[PDB]
């Protein structure tokens, strides 16, 4: 059909057919009388499979012969999402296989929308590691994602009444064709025990074994041929596990617990044991599995010329200690030696500034889980509080603001300082996120080691975030200025010359409008809602934070309800506000928005006066298969967090790529954005970073915005007097508390520029075709925030090693 | 090579070779530089699944047309062992593969040893089961197996220190490339609640659900191309189950844990709340999937025409209540015709007598988690017992022995009672136990409904227990008489007319030979074992029990060794003594047994005097594969239980049909072996069931024995006083005082005639020519014991339907 999606040749649409009955014969053991859809899709995916084995056993040769650098990501978080429709996009199958089901009498659409989502993360930091690993095998770095092989991934959320509820996410319930176990692989990591000092230093006893066993997925680049691994680490119990005898094969699920289910949590932590035994179980798996894979190739001189580990966050930070162990219990080298080869191997990403989002474990924990580790972790802190009392002789302040050990009622390690001070780069995700770092939190450790500290803007890969969702825009692009840009997205200037251009400024608008047209029939089929796709989409999708504040967008929200009813036959523009994300199941105030967002739509949605003039609708159990549709069918992109609190954002260059306009503060990433589209072409508003720090050391006083702005005033009135909720008068009593007495994200200071800022919106898309032309200017800026850029910094700054877009042999 | 193992074509060696080569590529994802021998193992059974799976779809499609009566086989146990083999054996395929795997430059033999065990049975009863399925198939009826899939089966047993050690039994680690996940079946399976009476009848409430998931293994006839279904189902959480968060995901396990182990108990009940929630899982699933099988085939009175349920043994008991709450609670028929629907439906086959072994469910327990069966079970119990009253007036005592439930301490279910009275047939397992049932515990029952009462004496598949294991003897058999017996064992009687053929006899002395060549190599290479394979093949391999006697042999076996002491320079026919078996891990008595056995082994073996002349060897891990090695290489079967203990025995008739001279009690099937041999070909000692009645009702005085008899005397005071525990003078203390005071089994009455027949033995083992004329009368005479001739049986006089030896087209 479409030109981006590949040859449907003679030869290859014969092929298909014949191994997808092969499969559906022989793998499925059905007919086509006793076949359900769900049969139809595992025969397509095993067939399309087929296609990626013989390109994934001849990388693993290529890397083998060569020995390149390896690069190991390390990350307790990889959020994938559906892997058919991008293995066919990389592979250049996805027309062949369109009309190889479409004679076979089947749908494949309807076919891709039967696999399960590989949720194995919470929202940016594990999509983060997704995009990375396809932007890696499409730059043919020889590249590992290494995680943990979560049995229940992110919650399924349901809307029950208004409120959130959790359901378990048995994603591997019918089974993943994606994965091969390699128990061949399999690894003991030990717990608990005690350290004993011997003649020849000291050794780990006493211990709980655990196996480790991998499970392996392809990673296909894009149409190179290459097929990188993602290697997914399974608990499994020793066969003599507690060997009455019932109970202890019963009691193997204590040892297997540790890879049943993700943490819920997004930028929050939570210090509870089992979430501990995670991120050492990954560490210490991982990290005897890149020493085998050296010495399978004594020398560790050169283990960092040949080894790259990148630490996605602090949570896999244990890699320094652990390599410290190894390299200075069981292979003997003396402490400075596997120092100078800790540093020159690990690396770190610090990805938030919030102080509740960091890790500090207390040292009991650490005691009595890894006495090893501490001992290791005392000894770095020594050696490097002596390098710092070096440096500034006298400074006994310095040396407790630096010190990895935090002392108090308890206490703790800062695994932040850790990492630090074990890796040999370390990186923020933005431009600002990057200044924040030198300027705030770690400007000690930025005096001490300047050289250290570096900025990695993210990015998103433009496979599936445009080629895969957006199909439609993606050809009309192509049709302009070719192909190329899919794997060079800075290419998309080029589209620059054509804003002028009337029949591309038409086909655009009419891209989206198809998109918005597909979406409003997506809604009344799958969740039974009537919206207007007319009106302007106004999306804001992310996990729940107060930070992110989609409490800002309920205030406006109800402010247009009100401006309505007090004028109700003057003209509005129409919207259609969607907000969707999951809250963390322990974080009520989340839980609490989700349930005022619902009450707002119940007003709202059913006021006669109202009409299809406004309708706000909760979007259920926001995850990577609904970005993929709600995205390419949004107007306008909410990126309003309180300046300085969103570290990059990704979400935003999602909906730029796209084809959205931007109402956002100059946060994270949107800073970027904006210089690079051109502050004209961007909706901002609001503080500051330098405006939030003045009001702090002023003291934020909210009743002071109250009493000044009468709109906001009568909000907060209907809030606390139960305009919202008529049989619970006093339902939000702790939003407008929180609101009013302790709001650390300063939600009214924006207000009134907000809705301001929401009006020049309005204006805009009145006229479409000035709508639409800033359209593109947006779209044709967004090639600086493609993964590609990211890892190719990343590859030449940080690891050393050099990208290549060259293609391996078929 | 051999000619019962197939044809090896040049078309079909190709083809295999091409496939297998494919299946290591795109399916294992190797090539011939990585490959481990697990992969070649796995590349195999790909391969020979292909030919599987196309005569399974065309099975299941030819009962869907013709509709016939189907077979419900509803165990806890099957013991199925290794399934590749047996596949290949089946499918005519066997040479075809080791003449492909040779070409490729692998030994076919070795990659057999890779694939793990379905251990899915304690013993006699799982293997029963498992030998059932095979004669099913290969006599074309429409059979079912269900059951449970474990995922630990029977454990691993080690021997450490002559103690035996349990480890868990992790099958499923690799994989299994037989099943197939049918996740389109899962039904939910309720348990606890409360019961609620409306206006139309009972409701069973508030329940606790968990889902049960099947999971379907081919099973193959003998070159017919049928290839029947065995159903195994898998215990599921449901997705809101216990839906802080984390907890109630972790606390899946409680529901998942009902299909996590096999109960160990062979021959013993444990009354456990877990055991009874897997005999309900097993039954309400099934029972489910039986009617919606049926109803999509309302009319209920054609059920019992359409539908046969074999219980084996009283583990899946609540099928019949189940039967009777969904007939009357969902079905809404009335009591009456629910009932005469149930009783034909369902058949009883009693695998045992020992009163240890019997079911008897404390009502507490019944009440709590199945509360609407308890009140079926009582309301079957009244109707029952008012019919008893009717046909013996006045019998107050009769209505209390017949009762359902048992009066005292706690109440109980007796479910054998239960099975008596919903089943319209109730079977014994050879000829002298339904005797035994109808003279003895069932008499009453029996006096009410005689017609109910049959027998069914046990057999074995002879393709798992001839063609398969003992290779060159079904060779060596075909040469004479044909192929033909395989299928119909009968027609192995014409080799009664090669008894003096000269050629005959050296042939099957040298197929013996070879089977113990290879199996005392076989010891050397796994276990570092040296042994004589000129001696005699001495072997006991069972459960390990007091009723199956290990003892009595060991009190042989001490003999031998005091005689050679005594007369050291006296000639005497050498011999290795082989007992092998699992201890249930509680049953402390028989863990003793083991110990003993062992310690005998440390003096025996390493006494210069004795030489090669008598060792002592105690068979670890006894299992379906490992009985496969040691019968074939077996001359000398023992089977020694008290006459009246052993229901029937099939191991007995494995060793018949593989050459090997029985030494036994008249006991079990033992009684019909000797029968259909004559008795001149058997080594029969000891009482008989009527002295065993005689010596109860004059009392059992075991120093009688001890007194009377110096060599017994002197193996008692050996025990005692330390002779084969040094460091440990008292550790068989408990086996001494048992065989003094508490001996149930009767072990010193049998030691004289026991002694005296072994004395025979070695008198008949010194001219092998009359050896080996005796070996062929009795596997020319064990075609009785071919499972197809009892299978034949269920079908005509229980089950109702006709078995057919016609092909389905290939
Ligand atoms: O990168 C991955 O996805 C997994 C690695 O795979 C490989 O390195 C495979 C290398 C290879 C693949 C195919 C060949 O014909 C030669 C070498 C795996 O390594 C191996 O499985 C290596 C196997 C092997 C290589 C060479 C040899 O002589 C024997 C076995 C690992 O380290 O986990
Ligand atoms: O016996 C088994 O091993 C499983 C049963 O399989 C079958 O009965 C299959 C029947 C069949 C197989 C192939 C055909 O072309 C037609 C019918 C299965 O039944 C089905 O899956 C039936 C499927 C089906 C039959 C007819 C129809 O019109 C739709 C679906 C069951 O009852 O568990």
């Not at 309807?110 to 999509?127: H, T, V, Y």
């Not at 020159?344 to 006495?371: D, F, G, M, Q, S």
């Not at 949107?670 to 009001?695: K, P, Q, S």
């Amino acid at each position: 059909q479409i030109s981006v999606r590949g040859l449907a040749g003679v030869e290859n649409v014969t092929e298909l057919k014949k191994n997808f009955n092969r499969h559906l014969h022989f793998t499925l053991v059905k007919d086509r009388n006793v076949a359900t859809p769900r049969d139809y899709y595992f025969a397509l995916a095993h067939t399309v499979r087929d296609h990626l084995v013989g390109r994934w056993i001849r990388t693993q040769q290529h890397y083998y012969e060569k020995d390149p650098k390896r690069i190991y990501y390390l990350s307790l978080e990889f959020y994938m999402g559906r892997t058919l429709q991008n293995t066919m996009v990389n592979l250049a199958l996805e027309n062949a296989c369109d009309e190889a089901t479409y004679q076979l009498g089947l749908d494949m659409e309807e076919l891709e929308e039967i696999e399960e989502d590989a949720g194995l993360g919470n929202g940016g930091l594990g999509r983060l590691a997704a995009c990375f690993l396809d932007s890696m095998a499409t730059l043919g770095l020889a590249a590992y994602g290494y995680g943990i092989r979560y049995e229940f991934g992110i919650f399924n959320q349901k809307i029950c009444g208004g409120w959130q509820m959790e359901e378990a996410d048995d994603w591997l319930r019918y089974g993943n064709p994606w994965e091969k176990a390699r128990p061949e692989f399999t690894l003991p990591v030990h717990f608990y025990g005690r350290v004993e000092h011997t003649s020849q230093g000291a050794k780990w006893v006493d211990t709980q074994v655990v196996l480790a066993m991998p499970y392996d997925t392809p990673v296909p680049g894009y149409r190179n041929n290459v097929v990188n691994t993602m290697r997914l680490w399974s608990a499994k119990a020793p066969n003599d596990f507690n060997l009455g005898y019932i109970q202890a094969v019963l009691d193997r699920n204590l040892a297997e617990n540790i890879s049943r289910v993700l943490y819920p949590n997004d930028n929050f932590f939570e210090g509870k044991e089992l979430r501990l035994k995670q991120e050492y179980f990954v560490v210490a798996a991982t990290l005897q599995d890149i020493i085998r894979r050296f010495k399978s190739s004594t020398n560790f001189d050169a283990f960092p010329d040949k080894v790259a580990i990148q630490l996605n966050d602090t949570h896999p930070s244990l890699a320094i200690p652990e390599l410290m162990r190894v390299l200075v219990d069981l292979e003997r080298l003396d402490w400075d030696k596997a120092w100078e080869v800790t540093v020159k191997t690990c690396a770190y990403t610090n990805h938030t500034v919030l102080p509740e989002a960091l890790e500090r474990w207390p040292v009991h924990l650490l005691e009595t889980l890894l006495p090893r580790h501490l001992q290791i972790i005392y000894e770095i802190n020594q050696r490097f509080l002596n390098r710092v009392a070096a440096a500034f002789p006298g400074d006994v302040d310095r040396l407790r603001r630096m010190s990895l050990v935090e002392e108090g009622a308890v206490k703790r390690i800062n695994m932040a300082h850790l990492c630090i001070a074990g890796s040999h780069a370390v990186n923020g995700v933005a431009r600002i996120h990057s200044e924040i770092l030198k300027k705030t939190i770690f400007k000690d450790f930025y005096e001490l080691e300047p050289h250290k500290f570096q900025n990695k803007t993210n990015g998103i890969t433009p496979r599936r975030w445009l080629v895969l969702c957006n199909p439609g825009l993606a050809e009309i692009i192509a049709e302009r200025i070719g192909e190329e840009y899919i794997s060079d997205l800075d290419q998309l200037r080029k589209l620059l010359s054509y804003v002028d251009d009337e029949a591309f400024i038409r086909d655009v608008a009419k891209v989206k409008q198809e998109n918005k047209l597909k979406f409003a029939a997506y809604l009344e089929r799958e969740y039974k809602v009537h919206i207007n796709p007319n009106s302007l989409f106004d999306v804001q999708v992310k996990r729940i934070h107060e930070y992110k504040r989609q409490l800002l967008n309920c205030l406006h929200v109800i402010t247009l309800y009100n401006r309505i009813k007090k004028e109700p036959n003057k003209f509005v523009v129409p919207r259609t506000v969607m907000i969707g994300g999951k809250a963390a199941p322990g974080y009520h105030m989340a839980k609490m928005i989700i349930k005022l967002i619902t009450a707002i739509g119940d007003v709202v949605n059913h006021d006669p006066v109202v009409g299809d003039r406004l309708r706000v609708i909760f979007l259920e159990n926001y995850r990577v298969s609904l970005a993929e549709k709600v995205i390419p069918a949004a107007d306008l992109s909410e990126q309003i967090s309180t300046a300085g609190t969103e570290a990059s954002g990704t979400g935003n260059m999602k909906f730029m790529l796209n084809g959205a306009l931007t109402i956002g503060t100059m946060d994270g990433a949107n800073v970027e954005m904006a210089e690079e589209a051109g502050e004209e072409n961007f909706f901002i508003f609001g503080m500051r970073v330098e405006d939030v720090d003045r009001l702090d050391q002023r003291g934020y006083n909210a009743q002071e915005y109250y009493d000044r702005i009468p709109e906001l005033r009568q909000i907060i009135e209907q809030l606390s007097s139960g305009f919202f909720s008529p049989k619970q008068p006093d339902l939000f009593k702790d939003i407008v508390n929180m609101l009013m007495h302790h709001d650390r994200f300063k939600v009214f200071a924006d207000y009134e520029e907000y809705v301001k800022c929401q009006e020049r919106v309005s204006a805009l898309y009145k006229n479409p075709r000035e709508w639409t032309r800033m359209v593109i200017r947006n779209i044709a800026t967004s090639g600086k925030f493609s993964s590609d850029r990211t890892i190719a910094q990343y590859a030449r700054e940080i690891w050393g090693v050099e990208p290549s877009r060259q293609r391996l042999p078929a």
